[model samples]
Target chain A: GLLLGDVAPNFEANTTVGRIRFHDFLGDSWGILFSHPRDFTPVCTTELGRAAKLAPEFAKRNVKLIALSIDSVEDHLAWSKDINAYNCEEPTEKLPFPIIDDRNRELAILLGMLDPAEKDEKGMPVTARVVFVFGPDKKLKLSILYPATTGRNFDEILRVVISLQLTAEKRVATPVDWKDGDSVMVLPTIPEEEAKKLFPKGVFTKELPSGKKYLRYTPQP
Target chain B: GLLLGDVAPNFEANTTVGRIRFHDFLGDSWGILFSHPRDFTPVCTTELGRAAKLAPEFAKRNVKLIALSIDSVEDHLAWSKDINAYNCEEPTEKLPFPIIDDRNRELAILLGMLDPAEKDEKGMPVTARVVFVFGPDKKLKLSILYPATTGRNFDEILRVVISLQLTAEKRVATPVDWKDGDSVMVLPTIPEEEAKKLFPKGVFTKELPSGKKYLRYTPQP
Candidate 1:
């Protein structure tokens, strides 16, 4: 339910790692808070294992990862064994990130991560596959909400983190299907004269019938 | 602010094509409603052009694409020429899809696409780069909200459409980083005996230390 630029609310709750304030755990680093329907489920099992495997890549980007579900720490701890064993090729003694226990659905409601259509055995709504990316400033920068029937792609998540960080540090925006080191567009707000000075690498414009040179490209800064 | 499973609110608005009710425009087909920060902006121009080039890909999936911004139809008309000239190799007499004129920000507020941090020249808040996918039932299925600085990946959007349609037709869910023709996970709700019967091709499970066989895989149906 949170909007872009909204500060992610701080909360105190138990996690697989231990109790701590959410903001304190994510202090001064980009963070990704994702949720799955439940533990030990088929799609979630693969998703968690994939996230665990990509922990180092996230660390390299100075980003912290945390997961949440309605299950308690006991369920998370027990299911983590299955995750490690399934991903046996690069198994870890424990999951690289902590899993928050939202048994009361407090965080789910706060973040609007609940999927009313997907119910548990007790006929209670379950948390959807939701990912919220927050910048070091703790402001929500991007989010994706998917239903229980569909699994998410972590590679896209990593790609967006790179895009978000680059945009935050420069006066440019990435283009469609953009990846690392791809040419980026200079912001239109920058005048042509200013763009030439800002992008020392060089700026190329695609001439159009409209005679507007707004589509200026520069190598990723 | 709409959540998954919620009915996408229907409204009448004038567009580049013509005035039509929202639901009537998406009759019996999957639909994508995306918004840009503005019409003549740098990132949006490239995004619109990319979407134009992929019009056939979206049509192949039985999905209708529509874009919205605060700009009026006149602006959209003028912008189409620029788009065609910029992408001359595959120029179209007109943009393949319609652009909704939301000068009042009614749709923006209703769909929660407004980004307060990004403003127009008049200091008015602009819509963020938001995409909402709906099913034939007219229920919201998936969504992604990105700030203005990061452009979206249409390939990811197309990939999810396949995953959503496949999951709707079968009792399967794609795993992380799944692509078309890739193996899919059987829903956890399906028992092993039922899964074997359901997936005649074959069902395989990854043995884990916990001895739980929840990680069942089958060729995508």
Candidate 2:
């Protein structure tokens, strides 16, 4: 329920690795805290394995990935083997991220991640696919929650991360269908003359029929 | 504050076009209700104008776009001129979507979209970038809230819509970076025997060292 820019909830809990302060685990770097409903579930197994394979991609961006499962630490440890096998990488790549052990649903319930549609044969609650993107300053950047039936897309997550990081460093925003190297828009608040000095590679200000000079595009460096 | 699968709050509102009942505008199809912090703002001008340019993309997908502005309808009408001009399209293409006038903060306050960072010179409240995706079944599918500085990406929004629509029609889920027609994961609950019958093209179950056979992939038709 936290809105964008809200201070991310800081909580300490036991993880696949060990107990650590939530804020300290993400000290001065971007963080992605995601949760899975259960540890042994196949969808969660495939999804977290992909996250493990994409470690280098995320690490290079100074972003850390920490996962959570609504199961015991013992279950998570056993599940890691399946995650490694599903990764299909040589030398049995390890899950670069720690899987949080929220067996009591402390973190899951706190985040309001349970989907009503999902129920175990026991009729117990299951966590939805919940994702929280945090900034270096630890403010909430994005919150995505999808049902159990749909696996989340990391490409969109990374794209948004790129957009967030770029906007933080420069007064620019990505346009529709924008990828890493695509053209981005220059903020209108920045005067055209000022933008020229700011984005010296130069700005492509679209010629408008209305003669308004606000739509400016710039190349990504 | 609405969660996925929750019924959207039904209400009557005065939009730039005229009075409207929210559900009536989006009967039996997908709907995307997004909000701007205020009218006449630089970032909003570009965002709504971009939404206008992608009308056909949403239209063909049976998706409707309705915008809400935290200002008056008169301001919305005047602002549409700027949005059209910003789009740089010839002949003032209509604002393909209606902009709801929430002057009294009726919708904004109810949705909890106002951000703390933004306090205009007048110090009046401004809503954040709030996006709600509703399915034809009238259940909330996605809730996205972006801060003031960064503009929301409609491309990611459409990608998610594709994923949602595709999964609703079938028992498959898109993988990590999968887009339209990419290989998708078959529901784990589907027996391999039953899946072979369902997906005649074939199913690729990843050979796992863990000795579990739930990882199944199918080429989306």
Candidate 3:
């Protein structure tokens, strides 16, 4: 199973866009590959439909949004109709991304996304709401897992993309409840003696009785 | 590990405020318990501090925000001072929630939150970013797990709470990228036969070629 810091497993599969190698598909860009247990399911429909709507947003971040289902590529084409129909109201031109067909569940098991507690009506292990975010470096940067009952919030996915990109550029960590362009936690490695220039706007170090000044915060606009 | 719809484990522990039962603390209100690996760490500090800032927002949603750290109450108390100081710019009267002192890692182990990939200098297992959203009835409505390096977006958590509450009141599921009062999917069980009056806003049954016609959606405002 893939873990954070591990290189995302490369696989070849049939997608609505056609057969493609995973590594080849992600040449030099970030990628998001989330999986659903089946095609034509209710929750998966909404999730995929929403993925269709977020194309411009995903592209703006240099991330490709692809979804996987344990069904045939032909099935994905059939189900794509439902996805397109679901988002028809004020919808854009067409589905903005590809839906992979992993009918054998090969990629599902590789990512540990198949949940045992839940299964399809046919008693097949269903894929958990697993969303793997890959950095341009092809490393597993982030993972989001939710139950099928809970549809994903793509907005949060966008939020994490922002956080990851921010941290990658600086020695700062985005704070909790953090939003775009919010104050972030400065790394501890930067000694108090050197925070002056590192955080030009300002820095506030929370005082601890242990005399350990670990909490350094800076707001950057 | 707690899956969606599982009853969150009930535990009694010490916190900065005092000793309390987890279930009792959430009495008649929704609850959020986010676990951090260690105390006096920078990422954890901002997470806890941000939770404090959301007091009114959480209260409005009838949810209490609390945290767990592998330290004693004394340490949490010392940390609480730092927490208040960190958010000094617009500080609340005091910390809005208790920080559970799970020094022994009892709660963390029970919830399957310890990350095997990373650790502090002490060679201890650091907790993962596991956030549990429990209902007033104590069922796990949703679970969010993130790596320690990436701090959480409380905006997404708040959005999920709203979605869950809205869905619980009626038979609906929030669609992907869903926000408060967006269009939602009507459960398959609720047929076109009776959706007329049930959803006064009306339902849109997306036409499917399979002719099953189970995908029904309605706008809930």
Per-candidate TM equals 0.97, 0.89, 0.79
Query: Per-residue error at A110 for model 1, in Å?
Result: 1.0
Best by DockQ: 1
In model 2, what are the clashing residue pairs, if there are any? none
lDDT of each prediction vs. the true structure? 0.88, 0.78, 0.76
Task: List pairs with backbone clashes in candidate 1.
Answer: none
What fraction of the true Cα-Cα contacts (under 8 Å, chains A to B) does candidate 3 also have? 0.50
- Write the residue-wise lDDT of candidate 1 on B10-88 in tens digits: 8899998999999999988899999999877778988998998888998998999999998988888888888877777
Query: What C-alpha lDDT, on a 0 to 100 scale, does residue B119 get in candidate 2?
Result: 48
Q: Supply candidate 1's per-residue lDDT for B112.
A: 87
TM-score per model (chain B): 0.96, 0.94, 0.90
Q: What lDDT tens digits, residue by residue, belong to model 2 across residues A114-179?
A: 776676666788787888989888888777777676677776777778888888888887655567
Worst 10 residues of 3 chain A by lDDT: A86-95
Model 2 gets an lDDT of 0.78
Q: Give the lDDT ranking, best first.
A: 1, 2, 3
Give stretches of model 2 more than 4 Å off: A90-93, A192-197, A203-213, B40-46, B85-90
lDDT of 1 by residue, A27-91 (tens): 99999999999998888988998999899999999999999999989889888988887688544
